[PDB]
């Protein structure tokens, strides 16, 4: 139940989770620097740049 919040907008590619600054989402995997996440807004899953978010 680690929850992160967007610090910048991210327009991603197929397989990424796109988000906007302030969006909060669950981290589903935190390995490496690209993470799996589910958006609290949409329940949509995808990969995100870890440097775009913070706990």
């Amino acid at each position: 139940d680690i929850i992160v919040v967007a610090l910048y907008d991210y327009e991603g590619w197929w397989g990424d989770l796109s988000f906007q600054k302030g969006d909060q989402m669950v981290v589903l995997e935190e390995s490496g620097e690209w993470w799996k996440a589910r958006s609290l807004a949409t329940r949509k899953e995808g990969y995100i740049p870890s440097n775009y978010v913070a706990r």
């Binding site: 991210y10 590619w13 620097e33 870890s50 775009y52």
Partner: protein
């Protein structure tokens, strides 16, 4: 906005990015060269965090198929310079970059999202 962390090119990235490049009018019909291969590598590395290990093509004469499945940009020979000019001037055609001396051009082919032609045609090259 910061740079995104580096990553390998998944086939989904390959398909999504190929269509995006296609739609924004890039690459189609442009002459292939080693320099331009590297320019492409560099652009996507420093713009999408793509490690430049995905852009490889099949060897023999004729059409060169991308060896990363999902990348939709193949190399098509064009029917059309001495070696000394090649050395001293930046001629931008694959005539001397290409081991088989063909002049290659980039062509968009979306069936490359459906058929892994490189793998099905040239398994030995993997």
């Amino acid at each position: 906005r910061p740079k995104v962390p580096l990553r390998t090119m998944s086939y989904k990235l390959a398909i999504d990015m190929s269509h995006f490049i296609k739609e924004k009018g890039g690459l189609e019909g442009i002459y292939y060269s080693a320099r331009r291969h590297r320019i492409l590598d560099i652009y996507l590395e420093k713009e999408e965090g793509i490690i430049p290990d995905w852009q490889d093509y099949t060897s023999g004469p004729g059409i060169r198929y991308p060896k990363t499945f999902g990348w939709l940009w193949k190399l098509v020979p064009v029917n059309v310079e001495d070696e000394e000019h090649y050395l001293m001037h930046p001629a931008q055609t694959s005539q001397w970059d290409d081991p088989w001396g063909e002049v290659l051009a980039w062509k968009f082919d979306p069936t490359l999202a459906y058929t892994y032609e490189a793998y099905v045609r040239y398994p030995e090259e993997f």
